[PDB]
Amino acid sequence: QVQLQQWGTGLLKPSETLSLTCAVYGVSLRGYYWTWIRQSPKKGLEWIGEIDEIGRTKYSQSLRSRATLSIDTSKKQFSLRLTSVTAADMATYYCARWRLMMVDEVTRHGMDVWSQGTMVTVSS
Amino acid sequence: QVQLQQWGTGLLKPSETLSLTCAVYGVSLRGYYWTWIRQSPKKGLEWIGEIDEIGRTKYSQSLRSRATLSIDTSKKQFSLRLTSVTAADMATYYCARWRLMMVDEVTRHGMDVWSQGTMVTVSS
Amino acid sequence: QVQLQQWGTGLLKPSETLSLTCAVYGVSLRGYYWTWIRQSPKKGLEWIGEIDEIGRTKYSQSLRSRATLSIDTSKKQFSLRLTSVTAADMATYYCARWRLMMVDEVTRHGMDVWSQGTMVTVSS
Amino acid sequence: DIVMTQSPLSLSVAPGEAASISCRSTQSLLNRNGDNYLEWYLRRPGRSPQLLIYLGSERALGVPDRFSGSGSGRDFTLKISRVEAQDVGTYYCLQTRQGAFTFGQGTKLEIK
Amino acid sequence: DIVMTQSPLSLSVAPGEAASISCRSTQSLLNRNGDNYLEWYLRRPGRSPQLLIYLGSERALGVPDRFSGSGSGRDFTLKISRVEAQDVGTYYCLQTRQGAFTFGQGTKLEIK
Amino acid sequence: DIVMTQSPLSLSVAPGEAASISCRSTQSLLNRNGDNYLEWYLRRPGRSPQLLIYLGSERALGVPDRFSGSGSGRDFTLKISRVEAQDVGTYYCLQTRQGAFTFGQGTKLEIK
Amino acid sequence: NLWVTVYYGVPVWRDADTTLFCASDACVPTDPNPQEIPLENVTENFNMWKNNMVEQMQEDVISLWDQSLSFDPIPIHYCAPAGYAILKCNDKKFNGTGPCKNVSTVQCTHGIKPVVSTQLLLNGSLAEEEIIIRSENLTNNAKNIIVHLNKSVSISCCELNGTEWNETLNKVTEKLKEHFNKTIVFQPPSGGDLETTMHHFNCRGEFFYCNTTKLFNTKEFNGTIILPCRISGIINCTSNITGIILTRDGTDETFRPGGGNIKDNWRSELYKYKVVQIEPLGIAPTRCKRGFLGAAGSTMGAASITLTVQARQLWLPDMTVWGIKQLQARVLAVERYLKDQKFLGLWGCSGKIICCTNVPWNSTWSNKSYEEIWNNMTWIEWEKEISNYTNRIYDLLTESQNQQ
Amino acid sequence: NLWVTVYYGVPVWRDADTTLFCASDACVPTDPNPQEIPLENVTENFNMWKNNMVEQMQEDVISLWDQSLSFDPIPIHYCAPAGYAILKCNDKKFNGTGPCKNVSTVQCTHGIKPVVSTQLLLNGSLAEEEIIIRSENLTNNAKNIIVHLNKSVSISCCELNGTEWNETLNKVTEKLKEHFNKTIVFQPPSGGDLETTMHHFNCRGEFFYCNTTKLFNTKEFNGTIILPCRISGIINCTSNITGIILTRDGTDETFRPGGGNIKDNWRSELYKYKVVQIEPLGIAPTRCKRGFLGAAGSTMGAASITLTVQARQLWLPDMTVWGIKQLQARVLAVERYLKDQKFLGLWGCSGKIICCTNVPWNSTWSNKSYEEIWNNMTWIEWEKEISNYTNRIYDLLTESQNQQ
Amino acid sequence: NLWVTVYYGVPVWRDADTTLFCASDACVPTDPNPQEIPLENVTENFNMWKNNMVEQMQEDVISLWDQSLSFDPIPIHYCAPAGYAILKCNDKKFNGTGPCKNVSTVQCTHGIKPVVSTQLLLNGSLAEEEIIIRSENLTNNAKNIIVHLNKSVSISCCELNGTEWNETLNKVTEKLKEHFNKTIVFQPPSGGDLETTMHHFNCRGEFFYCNTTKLFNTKEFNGTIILPCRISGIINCTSNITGIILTRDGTDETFRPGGGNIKDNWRSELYKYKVVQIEPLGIAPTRCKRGFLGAAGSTMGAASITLTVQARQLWLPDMTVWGIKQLQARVLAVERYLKDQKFLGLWGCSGKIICCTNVPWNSTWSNKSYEEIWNNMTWIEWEKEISNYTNRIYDLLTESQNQQ
Ligand SMILES: *[C@@H]1O[C@H](CO)[C@@H](O)[C@H](O)[C@H]1NC(C)=O
Ligand SMILES: *[C@@H]1O[C@H](CO)[C@@H](O)[C@H](O)[C@H]1NC(C)=O
Ligand SMILES: *[C@@H]1O[C@H](CO)[C@@H](O)[C@H](O)[C@H]1NC(C)=O
Ligand SMILES: *[C@@H]1O[C@H](CO)[C@@H](O)[C@H](O)[C@H]1NC(C)=O
Ligand SMILES: *[C@@H]1O[C@H](CO)[C@@H](O)[C@H](O)[C@H]1NC(C)=O
Ligand SMILES: *[C@@H]1O[C@H](CO)[C@@H](O)[C@H](O)[C@H]1NC(C)=O
Ligand SMILES: *[C@@H]1O[C@H](CO)[C@@H](O)[C@H](O)[C@H]1NC(C)=O
Ligand SMILES: *[C@@H]1O[C@H](CO)[C@@H](O)[C@H](O)[C@H]1NC(C)=O
Ligand SMILES: *[C@@H]1O[C@H](CO)[C@@H](O)[C@H](O)[C@H]1NC(C)=O
């Protein structure tokens, strides 16, 4: 039984910077991938961010540089930071963990446990 | 020099079990194959069975389901057991020692050491 | 800062045996090639002989059976002997120290240092 | 880059029956030795989505033996047997062959 | 699964002369790097057989240097340069490439 | 075996100008990965020659950065940018691809 | 379908017995700053009564006594050689033997003072729980009993500080109640074993055999209480009552001090430790054909992914003299590594830690779904389950490798 | 035509020397149940006089005497290290030198009781069939003679029974008549000092020097005879005679008690054993290009095919302190294996025991037509014949692998 | 363009400290005729003051001295273990510290006479050209100094010859004028404890503490001077004055006999040797996409060419009990070789001395022309030029190799 939690921000004015923190309880973060995804009425599901535990990062081609992700193992959490949020970026955020197998490459399994999610809303 | 010897039955009527014992009086069974060849006044010399010292056995398709092979180590013999001898299977039996050579393969040299052979008859 | 020196032999009549000796002052004969090269007023530059430290030698096709080359490690020098010197071999001999690079095949760098070169005519 | 496309978006199915959902891609989406690089995800309304199918063939932990995926190349599908009122929701296809991981337009499973 | 064919079945040669035997196979008797997989044996009338030629080229202990031969593919042959009254008898050629080992039809050698 | 030929034999160059030499061989001089197997030497009148270009691209220590080389296949060319009273002399190509070594004809470079 | 794969360096261990080595800040290796690596979710069984710690350790301490001949005991440490580890529990309610869930791994044991005591353990390390009862089987009445305290009592010489005893007793028997359910009294053994019935220790290199009867017999202590001692007005030395040794005298029941020997004392002062041997080689099914121990106990896949190459194969000796035991241990470790590397090299597996081979995987070996092997089953128990067929698996792997 | 092929697991041995282990149940490891492996047909050259075992015997026993400074001499076995072997000649008419046929191999020697004695060997293993004579050269008067007995006679000390004594002397004389063609008489030494003339031994912890002059100065005991002895109101010594030491001076030839130093004693009991080096590397001509020591007398083909892949490096004790000599042996063995493995891997034949290489077979190396290579010669004979050119073969193999 | 390539067997070394093993003719490993390998043009800095080998030699001579608890001091030829080298400077004005050319390499050191002396070194190894002065800092620190002589002066018993003393004093004063400006004349000790104030040595089993004061002051001799002392006539002892220990007490200047300690006594000889560690692994740029130390200090090309297969692991003794230090060294050497071979084997460079792999050469590592790299710079300077990035280049090499 492993669980995830998120600390988030409420309503944001357009074009400023907002950060989302997300912590894990129950299992260490040494042997997985941690990713953030977002959902919206007009877009479905689109991948955003991926990170290992040493600090290897990976981002989508759309928001290649407009967002950054960081991790820390002292209290075992990670975080996103997104600058200049706009109206078209209506996005409810989810934390999740990809499981891995090493046979020839880092082959991927499903994303088993999903965080509750924060209804990050942007308005003027 | 090495020599071979055989023991077997005399007159045997069909549908019984034929048991033939063959003893070696020379080098051990460790590094050769022991094989049985059959000669008859009809159709020529044939092939019966092949045995290693571990117990690995090989048989022919003609007598696949009627002949079996046994070995031991205490007194260095090997033995045929052939079920349901028919009238058309009468055949003098010969023991022989196949030499072997190891080069990426079990290259099979000639069969130099041949037993003197024993006559076998059929009762009817 | 290395130097090459050579010992003169004066003039010789045709069909003679002529030996030329070349000593070194500098790095030992450890891992370089020691070769000689001939110069003529009307023949250009042609290759003669090559030696290593181990004693293995290489010669040209033009002088298969005319010259032999050898070395002496104690005095750190080398020499050749040329049997049946002809009147058509008016020559000037040069000693040479080919460098080497050991990467797979022994790649052949240039010829950094050159001996002063010695005159050899044929007397008649 | 990579775009999914699945059918049907919404279907009307009687309770307890079987439904098949087919999603297609634009690239080969086939492993050299492995089976596939596609996953099938399920989301209940208003809750975090779970896992259904990983690698295209096997099922996850705690999922009933009512979901089975198959396909190859540029077409994949999921069969679902003995649907219940609990499972009414949204099915999503996920792709992993290349970078820029991308879902497709989700499909709505509703009971007739 | 493999059948030999010897030729001739019987030939009558003057004593001390040279004779040649040839037997055909149904498959190529060639090793990847070896010589062949064929055997040559004697049989005196009413006595146990002995080795003559192994791997198609060489001869065993106590074999006089009068037995030779060679071949390839689906044809092999044995040769005697000098024959004696002692060697009157039979010669057989044997196959070993596949599992079903099988002899030939016998070659009887008799002196004029 | 291998004959080194080169052009031109003699040059009528103004002071400090650029001059180019082109030497052709009988076959290729290309290593599997190396630039070439060619040497490019110079000699002064009455003095012993020295190294200029080894492996066709680099220059040894003590060589001013005015000598350059290029080429492949059966044509290799060499270039000088600035010349003085020191550089008058004889430029030579040298071949080492095969077991036979040969300089070929010389290149007398002089100043009007 | 499913094909066998070799993993090297995977963190799975097993119980084993081996010779440890002494160190000190007969044995004088240097002791660096130690460190403890926690483990995530491993459950490990511990048993003090079946252990080789005491045997090797007692042999070493007796050797030190023999080599000595006027000295004070010096604290020492024990450490494992290359290829082993020391597992220690952390649960404050450790009942001597049983499972533990807070298990830490170390290379060098904590400080132990080689002091000898007979009836009352002196200079001993404390415990968090107020009082603990340790035994192999307290009900069987065929073994001795160790009582471990929380507040050490100062003993000069000899003298005892009065009421501190009484209150202490008022706790001890209380716990004993919930084990035997009767009032408990005490008395000397009434035996002739003068070597054990009498209390024994040493100070300043001089032995001390002291009589003691009032410590363990009720129906008045008040001020400081005194006892006779012989070999009290001769030498003043101090000591720490930390633990005591109690046995059962075959309604109210009587206990008896002194039942035991030196080994029981030594076990009581060092019992949280267990020697374990790592076995870095694993066989697992997947789809492919052609620091340490930190992740152990976690998911099989997560342990697989964190497995990375290492510069070192399989402390801080600097340039000292190892001695006989270290040299033997190093030789054994290096030959074990050579043997394992040859075993890997027998197959077509020429150096990679991750090794895919061409061998079919049948349903008999596991009978476990592919999902449950790399998402739920930890490495240690997976190896424990597959251990029944390891030799057959190795033989089949080699046979299908060389035959091509 | 033919090409060189490298075999690794080959049973060929050579002669060498080394140290050993002190099996005994100081150098004191354990000793489990041993086993003896016969050889089918090996003619082996034994030589007890040149043997290097006696030196190790004397050094180790002398170290034992110094360590002790009632002896209860434990039968001590000497165990060969890893990678070596011990050969025992079982023929029952063996003069200690020459060929032996019934040659077996054993891991650890039979029990030896290192009892010091002279002129009368005591507590030694008897002869299997009949009394025999051991000597380096019967015609060399500077050499000594060992007379080995078949029916031991007990001597109580001294008090000796004469009924068996003169019969044993008669049998000895009759046998010596075969080797020496003159009547033989015996005469006491009248030597220089105490040790070369009297009988020496030790019993129950004290030494005995006895006047044994009366047992050989034959001109009728017909009963028990008493010999003077000094250091009867003494502890008795009833040790049994196993053999005697006999020497000659200069036609009634005279034999002479006395002889050499203590060393010869261990020659009278450790003469059946030889120490032998295993050299597992073989080169053979084949038509291809691109347990151990058990059947070491079989034909090339049989020994080649019986070669299978091992799972052990190149075993009696368990978790025991080894000692200096054991560590020496183990480190030397592992270094030898590493060197040999690197040597084999230089040609790329790393993982496979059998390797065919691309080198033409220079027929001038051995002649020996291919038929007689794998049908008539033993492996050891093949190595003995090829040893003249092994270095050139190795160099050519390395050069051809380098050339590619 | 340029690609990295690994060479195994490069002659590059670095300063290191290790247990040099004792050896003599408690040290019996014996030694055959030694050999010295000259090095062509290596320039090596020597610092005898900070040498660690003398530290190991001391306290080991002390252990040998204590073990006997008369002595003919055997020349103890210290020698290096496997995988190490001893560099011997060979200049005539080396004075102990600084750069040295003509540096030779030797396996086993020169004979050393471990004779104790305090103020006058006895039986010390002589100088070669002229008297010399050694100090760690002659001017910046008032520390003890060593004076090395040319003609050893024979003294007996205690009994010295005046003429030689006057000559040596005159030459020493003249030489010291070259370093210190003031007039140098030697005054008496005027010190404290008699251990470091008088003359101390031992001879034929007897210690001698001779009060010597006439060898200084004299602000004369005209014959034989006598200085008897105590612990029949005195034993006819004899000795060779070879070196004198002096110390300044901060015009007219005063050196002082004695002072310092005995480490300085054993440093008066072992100042010509340094212990160095071979690191046979190098990386260099070239064009690819797919005995020892003799050439060190020569050009890159010659060392690359002469690097051929050693066909050995990386000696003098033959079948001898090695002891603790030998076996320690051998185990360490084999472990180092195994570690290095595993490190090389992580890439495809497994069985080849040279191996060139697929990694682009980042120009920031060297910033040196290819001609300059492979025609002008020796290996030892190249390793220093790359030592700043060895770890990262190794990691990049592994990362690029394991991708495929
Ligand atoms: C007390 O110890 C016993 C073993 O003696 C054990 O079985 C039991 O679980 C322990 N009680 C606990 C841990 O509460
Ligand atoms: C011991 O402590 C108990 C606490 O309940 C007290 O009743 C009793 O009087 C004490 N006995 C002595 C001797 O102090
Ligand atoms: C287990 O593997 C063996 C491989 O030899 C195979 O023969 C057997 O059929 C397998 N078990 C089952 C139940 O298939
Ligand atoms: C023992 O017999 C062998 C057999 O050849 C012989 O060589 C040897 O000389 C004999 N021993 C003696 C002592 O004569
Ligand atoms: C022993 O020799 C014979 C054997 O019977 C016997 O008659 C004789 O008396 C005995 N002599 C001695 C000296 O013991
Ligand atoms: C010597 O004592 C032993 C002790 O058992 C006894 O057997 C033996 O007969 C005694 N011998 C004599 C001569 O007293
Ligand atoms: C001496 O050896 C004989 C030979 O069998 C034996 O009977 C006797 O018991 C041995 N002596 C002793 C004291 O055991
Ligand atoms: C010793 O020689 C070194 C060589 O550089 C020099 O630096 C130093 O000053 C010299 N010292 C003495 C005391 O000669
Ligand atoms: C020492 O020698 C010098 C030589 O210049 C001489 O002047 C002086 O008198 C001598 N002193 C003694 C004491 O011999």
Side-chain angles (χ1 to χ4, degrees), chain G residues 230-261:
Chain G
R230 300 184 180 184
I231 191 65
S232 295
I234 179 168
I235 279 180
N236 177 8
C237 84
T238 183
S239 73
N240 282 105
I241 297 297
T242 68
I244 47 182
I245 312 299
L246 270 72
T247 66
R248 300 157 65 177
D249 191 19
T251 182
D252 52 354
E253 277 178 25
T254 311
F255 291 167
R256 162 197 290 167
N261 49 72

Side-chain angles (χ1 to χ4, degrees), chain G residues 360-365 392-393 396 399:
Chain G
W361 172 277
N362 84 359
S363 69
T364 315
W365 291 318
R392 284 158 41 143
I393 283 299
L396 289 174
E399 180 265 330

Side-chain angles (χ1 to χ4, degrees), chain I residues 283-331:
Chain I
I283 60 161
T286 186
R287 302 169 186 193
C288 276
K289 285 303 298 304
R290 200 177 298 280
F292 42 70
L293 277 68
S298 67
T299 317
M300 272 315 267
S304 58
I305 286 296
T306 198
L307 178 51
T308 60
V309 182
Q310 273 94 50
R312 50 165 150 201
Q313 193 42 268
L314 274 298
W315 270 248
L316 319 171
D318 191 5
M319 172 205 48
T320 306
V321 294
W322 270 339
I324 283 295
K325 286 190 291 294
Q326 294 297 109
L327 183 62
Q328 173 70 40
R330 294 293 320 248
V331 165

Side-chain angles (χ1 to χ4, degrees), chain G residues 93-99 135-138 179:
Chain G
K93 198 44 79 169
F94 189 45
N95 224 27
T97 71
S135 84
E136 202 279 336
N137 196 311
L138 73 164
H179 289 279

Side-chain angles (χ1 to χ4, degrees), chain G residues 121-126 149-155 164 168 239-243:
Chain G
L121 309 166
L122 315 176
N123 292 97
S125 299
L126 277 296
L149 283 72
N150 58 338
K151 40 190 179 183
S152 60
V153 192
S154 167
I155 293 293
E164 311 322 294
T168 302
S239 73
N240 282 105
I241 297 297
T242 68

Side-chain angles (χ1 to χ4, degrees), chain I residues 95 97 99 179:
Chain I
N95 75 7
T97 48
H179 294 265

